[PDB]
Amino acid sequence: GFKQDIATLRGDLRTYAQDIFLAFLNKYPDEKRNFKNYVGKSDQELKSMAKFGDHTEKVFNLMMEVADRATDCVPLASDASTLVQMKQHSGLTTGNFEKLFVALVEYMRASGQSFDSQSWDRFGKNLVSALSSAGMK
Numbered sequence: 001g002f003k004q005d006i007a008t009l010r011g012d013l014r015t016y017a018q019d020i021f022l023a024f025l026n027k028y029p030d031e032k033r034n035f036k037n038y039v040g041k042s043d044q045e046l047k048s049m050a051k052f053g054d055h056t057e058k059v060f061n062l063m064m065e066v067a068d069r070a071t072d073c074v075p076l077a078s079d080a081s082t083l084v085q086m087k088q089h090s091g092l093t094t095g096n097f098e099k100l101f102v103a104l105v106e107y108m109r110a111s112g113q114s115f116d117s118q119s120w121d122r123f124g125k126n127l128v129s130a131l132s133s134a135g136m137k
């Protein structure tokens with residue numbers, strides 16, 4: 001289930017991070033506006049960009065840590081607040097997290113693997129709720 005999915009994703013975190021994040025940017029093209037120099041790039045051009053690989057892996061590592069400290073797909077309120085208060089990232093919004101998790105769930109459902117896609121959908125809605133409660137716009 002969910003805990004095993006954290007283990008699967010981490011075992012190839014760079015590749016899963018990139019492919020899920022590309023699914024997200026392709027499903028919601030306006031999301032590239034928030035990232036310097038992503039606009040007008042193909043998937044392969046983005047993969048060439050040092051900060052794309054580095055930043056996307058750091059996004060997914062943080063989401064795997066929050067996921068790992070969650071109970072029944074409910075993250076720690078204290079993790080939501082540390083996220084809202086992260087240096088730089090003042091412009092983060094819950095809607096863009098709504099969309100990242102929609103993309104993640106559709107990726108898992110299309111995978112040939114026994115990901116607990118319903119648990120990640122729950123976790124997404126619970127992280128969004130928690131970020132909102134913690135004062136994210």
Ligand code: FDE
Nearest residue numbers: 033034035036037051055058059060061062088089091092
């Ligand atoms: C969702 C999310 C999550 C996250 C996470 C993270 C971690 C763990 C870490 C990090 C980092 C970072 N960011 Fe991060 N993140 C995000 C997002 C983001 C955005 C939108 C931005 C902006 C970009 C530009 O264009 O500027 C960022 C941003 C960012 C930054 C800036 C600078 C560079 O390098 O490029 C940094 C450093 N981020 N990060």
Ligand SMILES: Oc1ccc(Br)cc1
Nearest residue numbers: 034092093096097100
């Ligand atoms: O505002 C946001 C932009 C990108 C992500 Br991923 C999450 C929030």
